[PDB]
Structures are given as C-alpha cells and as structure tokens.
Amino acid sequence: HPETLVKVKDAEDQLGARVGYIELDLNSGKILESFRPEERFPMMSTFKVLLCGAVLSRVDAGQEQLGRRIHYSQNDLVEYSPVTEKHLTDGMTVRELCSAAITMSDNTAANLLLTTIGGPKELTAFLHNMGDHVTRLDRWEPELNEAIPNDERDTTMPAAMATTLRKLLTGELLTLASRQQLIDWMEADKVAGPLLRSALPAGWFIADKSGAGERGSRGIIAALGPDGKPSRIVVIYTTGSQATMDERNRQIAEIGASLIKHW
Numbered sequence: 001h002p003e004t005l006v007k008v009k010d011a012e013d014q015l016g017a018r019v020g021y022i023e024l025d026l027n028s029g030k031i032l033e034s035f036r037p038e039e040r041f042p043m044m045s046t047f048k049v050l051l052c053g054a055v056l057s058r059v060d061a062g063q064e065q066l067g068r069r070i071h072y073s074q075n076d077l078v079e080y081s082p083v084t085e086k087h088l089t090d091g092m093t094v095r096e097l098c099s100a101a102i103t104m105s106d107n108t109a110a111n112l113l114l115t116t117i118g119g120p121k122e123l124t125a126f127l128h129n130m131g132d133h134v135t136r137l138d139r140w141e142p143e144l145n146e147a148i149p150n151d152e153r154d155t156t157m158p159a160a161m162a163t164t165l166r167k168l169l170t171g172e173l174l175t176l177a178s179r180q181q182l183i184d185w186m187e188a189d190k191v192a193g194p195l196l197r198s199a200l201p202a203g204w205f206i207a208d209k210s211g212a213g214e215r216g217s218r219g220i221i222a223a224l225g226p227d228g229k230p231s232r233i234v235v236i237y238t239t240g241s242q243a244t245m246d247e248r249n250r251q252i253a254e255i256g257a258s259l260i261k262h263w
C-alpha cells in the first residue's frame, strides 16, 4: 500500500540513509510494493538463512548429516559468538550450528558451516544455480559487514533476496522436511524482538532473520501472515546512517506497523 511507502520515505529522511524495501506475495510471487528494489545493499547476517539453506540441500543429497558433530577451538572464535563460545569443549552438531546462526546470529557458527560447504564461493554458486544471479557472498564473518559504499561484495538487492527466500521456502529445491526445518529455525529467532516482531499482532505467524553491520547497516528478511501462516515476504535493508542502533530499530518497526495496518 502506498501509505507504507510514505513511511519508507519518512524513514530515509529520519535516518539520513537509503532504505530498500519489498513486499512479495508468497503464493504467486507478485511484487506488492517496492522501494529501491534493485539497488544493492549489504546482506549482513541475513545471509545466515541462505547458508543453512545450502547446508540443508547437502543434507537432502546425502552429503551432510544434521547430526554430524563439529569440533573447533578458541582460535576459531570471532566477535558475536554467544552460543559457540559456550561449547568449546564438546563441539556442536550441524543442526545446532544452524540453529545458533539463525536464532542468535552467532558468527563463529556461520564461519564453521561456511567452511563445511566450501566457503563463500560455493554459497555464491549455490545461489547462482537456483536463479539468483545477483546475491553474492565474498567474505567471512565478520569482515562481510564492512559496508564500504559502492562495494558489491557481500550484497544482495531487495528483489533478489525476496525471490530467493520465496524459492527456498516454497520451491522444489529442498524436500518438505528441510523446508520446514528452515522455517522452524527462522520462526525461533531470538535477537529480532525490537524489529518487525514488535509490530506483529497476536496470532500472526513470523519467521525472520535480521542483521547489523558497519556504516549504520541494518536489515531484516521475513515471511509473515495472519492466522498463524505466512503469506507475504518482506525484505528491508538500510545502510549509510549515522543513527544509533535504537533509531534504526525504531524506523524498521514503524515500517512494519505501517505494513501491518494496511495489510
């Protein structure tokens, strides 16, 4: 609804930065509303969903086991490793690593998984093969959050990410069981409380993934809908702001409040 676009422009004015937004129909894939849909933005931690998607495809293919255990050490630990840092001694299974990377944004968990699949270049090749010729992963955590203006590394476009997420959640790409596992991880997200989740009415469904990075970068991808089932995909990215994390969270939540009001 165009009233949501008014809020999106207002957020750009408040933040002194670019905001990219897209609302996509889950079922048909039609674009319902967009703002800077084809400009590139840094993906930040929202890539974590794509990563586990690639891991699940390997599991479906017999090349990986969710139950497999990975051991790492103090040397692998990077900033923002709340979960991995507590399991140094016993390691963690693939399943727990994906759960940590998705529900808590754990950086070390993502790096470990990136390694198992062959690194950024392979995650990038997996996306390419599913029809996404725009989104690209080039670095590991946390360097991928640099957000250097005009840099293409580690970026996606709102339309690219929305359509890719739709294919992952509803395409023939993953088996039903894996699709569900993916949705289960996103629905259990524990760090995105002050974003879309704060505008969501009771009884709605939400499965999401946030991210933050340098240069005021912040973003969120989500599948949501009334009555406990998703029916739309929303992607929102911003970068360039000098505003505080709280101000960035607020504008994103005000964008969500508008989207919900005009559902």
Ligand SMILES: *[B]([O])([O])[C]([C]C1=[C][C]=[C]C(C([O])=O)=[C]1)[N]C([C])=O
Pocket: 044, 045, 046, 079, 080, 104, 105, 107, 141, 142, 145, 191, 192, 209, 210, 211, 212, 213, 214
């Ligand atoms: B991700 O954005 O690449 C990662 C870890 C992260 C930090 C702070 C907030 C979130 C989130 O999920 O909202 C994620 N970012 C960095 C800078 O390490």
